[PDB]
Design a protein around this ligand. Structure first.
Ligand code: BDF
Ligand code: BDF
Ligand code: BDF
Ligand code: BDF
Ligand code: BDF
Ligand code: BDF
Lengths: 90, 90, 90
């Protein structure tokens, strides 16, 4: 019933994203240098991990959301979240 | 009752920090290239995530410690741990 | 009984590694730019975290696998997984 978080950051400002899995829902809080605000990420799951990388100045984020034994990858390449190709056989 | 960890690293040596949430307490183990040792971070919580970034050679660490549904951000900018501005409405 | 994951990435392609702790076993799924595939990492544990760093083009990965209150570090320096020096007194 307690929340679980994952965090990533990029740059030097920096940008920070914190993902919280809470009661089956994963949401996102954002820092771009001046105030926390709610991000666009909203996906179901009880467990979350995240990684991100820059290509030049363009950020790419991958969030691994799991429900039960099933993990779904969600992708941000600057133009909205979409489901990635990740599969596992858990 | 089992522990949960989070890890971050920086540089090429590298520096590694491993945070362990255990029985409501989060502690920190450190590697700077030659031996593990206990770090200054000590904060309550049952769940931990971490991210870090360099500005030049200066490391900045953010630890997200959660108890129940409440997440507190702890900040290291080289001069002691202090509570950050992070809020969420879980 | 639900899975828990950790993720790391490097480069710009990028390379991604996703670790899944499931029913006491931690396994690894890999992306090197074109298709997910199963990695060599197989170690016991109920909880996983990971960090990685590059030295030039050489990747180094550290996986922190925990069972109960005992955390074991596993190391990849490009030539097979081996147990690291990490200790904690949980
Ligand atoms: O500026 C906020 C935002 O656009 O940053 C990139 C991603 O984290 C998005 O989910 C998020 O809404
Ligand atoms: O462009 C999306 C994608 O190819 O990005 C890299 C990996 O995250 C893949 O699983 C994912 O489908
Ligand atoms: O050298 C150890 C240390 O100073 O490194 C930076 C932070 O991880 C601190 O909590 C820690 O005590
Ligand atoms: O200087 C501290 C601070 O501004 O650093 C960036 C973010 O971690 C903020 O939540 C935090 O208050
Ligand atoms: O190319 C896959 C692989 O060699 O990548 C480096 C490590 O993640 C290994 O466990 C893994 O088998
Ligand atoms: O070469 C292996 C090693 O020295 O790498 C750095 C740290 O991960 C240590 O715990 C580990 O034993």
């Amino acid at each position: 019933s307690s929340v679980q978080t994952a965090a990533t950051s990029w740059g030097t400002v920096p940008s920070i994203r914190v993902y919280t899995a809470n009661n089956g829902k994963i949401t996102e809080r954002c820092w771009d240098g001046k105030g926390w605000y709610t991000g666009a990420f909203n996906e179901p799951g009880d467990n979350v991990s995240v990684t991100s990388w820059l290509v030049g100045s363009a950020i790419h984020i991958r969030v691994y959301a799991s429900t039960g034994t099933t993990t779904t990858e969600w992708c941000w390449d600057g133009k909205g979240w979409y489901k990635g190709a990740y599969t596992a056989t858990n």
